[PDB]
RNA sequence: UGACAU
């Protein structure tokens, strides 16, 4: 599978964004916690951030006029050469918070690219937990570095290895990857970490949990990796449990911690709604909710890949043109599904947790948790697919006491923190 | 369970 080439249409490159919403200016009022030694002062605006002219021009081309809180803090921190753990709610601009200052530094303090005997030595490694998120960050990096000499490349599974490998072999300043395909190329001597200036873990708490930690260790402790005191390490997420924050410390050097509001809190721009249903009732309740919301774009989350295929078939055999995305689908199908949803061709996407984190989709009207997740953090990520950049969103969650009772204390906390209604069955 | 190379 060779994915469709990245669009070189400038308009399309900068169009890939969610226009800021009615509550964007309200971001200003959120309390920001900063801890660690000698934090730089936050920047007041993109124009007063000591950026290079055409990096600023690209920010402005992207449609941005005012930096979000995470950006106000992260930009000067990164430009000062410091390590950073950055926490901010879903849809509040964490991607640009690291891309903009990194790209600025790659241009203001330029280093010639190295690629010897086919082995690329990227200056920036960005990793994320899923293939579609990795492609998204890649496309955002292309946006902010547009028209510059910087070369961005992508690496992720389910794709023709040679296609991605030959592209990487040409040399790249920034490599955005999922861990599996990254280490594949590293072990073939297609990629070395010898020129790394920045390592970024996006969805960092997920990258540091049990599933991904070995792959992170293999990167951070790779024989070719430049040591932690001679590079920068940046970590961003909407969630960060304290035990995972502790684990993060092994890969960080005298770092600053930035939390925009309560760590792991839900975006207050998402209206959170719950419906008490039995496992049986879920099917009709989903059908009813879709009928009542004709013309709305809905993202339906389920627990298993089996149920993702079932629900997709149910909603298709019923009414709407619907797509499905999960790990047992072909990578072409996963990308076609997401694009169909992102373009408007399809207004329903059925998804597993593969689509819970990071993905930036225009006008998600409703996020439905057909199955609630087992983790409150993942709940917060899922509902954050809507209500982004100051726009209002809606999440409707099906609650089954037989399956979801253990989550009640954590849900009630999340709702109370976000000033949402707590229904009687979650008290 | 669900992500994550060949
Ligand atoms: N300063 C800004 N002004 C206007 N729009 C912005 C700004 N910064 C980012 N955006 C847009 O806001 C959307 C959300 O950005 P993104 O970096 O995906 O948020 P995030 O905090 O990483 N979300 P998540 O990964 O779900 O926790 C994107 O469409 C950006 O293009
Ligand atoms: Mg993000």
**What is the fold-level CATH name, i.e. the topology of the largest domain?**
Rossmann fold
User: Measured on Cα atoms, how large is the radius of gyration?
Assistant: 21 Å
Distance between the termini: 49 Å
Q: What is the helix tally?
A: 16
Identify the CATH homologous superfamily of the largest domain: P-loop containing nucleotide triphosphate hydrolases
Report helical residue fraction.
25-40%
Q: How many domains, in number, for the residues? A: 2
The CATH level-2 architecture of the largest domain is identified as: 3-Layer(aba) Sandwich
How many beta strands in the DSSP annotation?
16
| Main β-sheet, spatial strand arrangement | 1-10-2-9-8-5-7-6
Beta content:
15-25%
PDB class: hydrolase
Keywords: hydrolase, transposon
Assembly: dimeric
Entry title: Crystal structure of the Bombyx mori Vasa helicase (E339Q) in complex with RNA and AMPPNP
Describe this structure as you would to a colleague.
The structure is a monomer. By secondary structure, the chain is α/β, with parallel strands linked by helices. It is globular, with a radius of gyration of 21 Å. The chain has 2 domains: 261 residues, 3-Layer(aba) Sandwich (Rossmann fold), CATH 3.40.50; 166 residues, Rossmann fold (3-Layer(aba) Sandwich), CATH 3.40.50.300. It has an 8-stranded mixed β-sheet. Strands 11-16-15-12-14-13 form a 6-stranded parallel β-sheet, with helices on both faces. It contains 16 helices and 16 strands. Helix 3 runs parallel beside helix 4 and helix 4 crosses helix 5. Helix 14 links the parallel strand 15 and strand 16. 36% of the residues lie in helices and 17% in strands. The chain binds phosphoaminophosphonic acid-adenylate ester (ANP) and magnesium ion. Phosphoaminophosphonic acid-adenylate ester binds next to helix 4. The site of phosphoaminophosphonic acid-adenylate ester has 22 residues, from helix 4. The structure holds one RNA strand of 6 nucleotides. It comes from Bombyx mori (Silk moth). One of its GO terms (molecular function) is nucleic acid binding. Its EC number is 3.6.4.13.
């Amino acid at each position: 599978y060779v994915p469709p080439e990245p669009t070189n249409d400038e308009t399309e490159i900068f169009s890939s964004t969610i226009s800021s919403g009615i509550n964007f200016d309200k971001f200003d009022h959120i309390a920001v916690k900063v801890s660690g030694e000698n934090p730089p002062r936050p920047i007041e605006s993109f124009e007063t951030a000591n950026l290079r002219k055409y990096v600023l021009d690209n920010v402005l081309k992207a449609g941005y006029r005012k930096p979000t809180p995470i950006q106000k803090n992260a930009i000067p921190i990164i430009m000062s050469g410091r390590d950073l753990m950055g926490c901010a709610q879903t849809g509040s601009g964490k991607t640009a918070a690291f891309l903009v200052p990194i790209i600025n530094m790659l241009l203001q303090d330029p280093k010639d690219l190295i690629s010897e005997n086919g082995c690329a030595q990227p200056q920036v490694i960005i990793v994320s937990p899923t293939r579609e998120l990795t492609l998204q960050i890649f496309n955002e990096a292309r946006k902010f570095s547009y028209g510059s000499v910087l070369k961005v490349a992508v690496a992720y599974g389910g794709t023709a290895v040679r296609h991605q490998g030959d592209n990487i072999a040409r040399g790249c300043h920034i490599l955005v990857a999922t861990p599996g395909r990254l280490h594949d190329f590293v072990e073939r001597n297609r990629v070395s970490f010898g020129s790394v200036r920045f390592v970024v873990l996006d969805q960092a708490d997920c990258m540091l949990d049990m599933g991904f930690m070995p792959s992170i260790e293999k990167m951070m402790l790779h024989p070719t990796m430049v040591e932690t005191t001679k590079r920068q390490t940046l970590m961003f997420s909407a969630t960060f449990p304290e035990d995972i924050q502790h684990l993060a410390g092994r890969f960080l050097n005298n770092y600053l911690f930035v939390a925009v509001g309560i760590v792991g809190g839900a975006s207050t721009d998402v209206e959170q709604i719950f419906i008490e249903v039995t496992k049986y009732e879920k099917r009709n309740s989903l059908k009813q909710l879709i009928e009542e919301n004709d013309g709305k774009r809905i993202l339906v989350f389920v627990e298993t890949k089996r149920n993702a295929d079932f629900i997709a078939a149910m909603l298709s055999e019923q009414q709407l043109l619907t797509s499905s995305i999960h790990g047992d689908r072909m990578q072409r199908e996963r990308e076609e599904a997401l694009q169909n949803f992102k373009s408007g061709k399809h207004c329903i996407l059925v998804a597993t947790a593969v689509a819970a984190r990071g993905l930036d989709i225009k006008n998600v009207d409703i996020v439905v948790n057909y199955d609630l997740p087992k983790s409150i953090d993942e709940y917060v990520h899922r509902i954050g697919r809507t209500g982004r950049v100051g726009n209002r969103g809606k999440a409707v969650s099906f609650y089954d006491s037989d399956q979801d009772l253990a989550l009640v204390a954590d849900l009630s906390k999340i709702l109370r923190q976000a000033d949402q209604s707590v229904p009687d069955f979650l008290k």
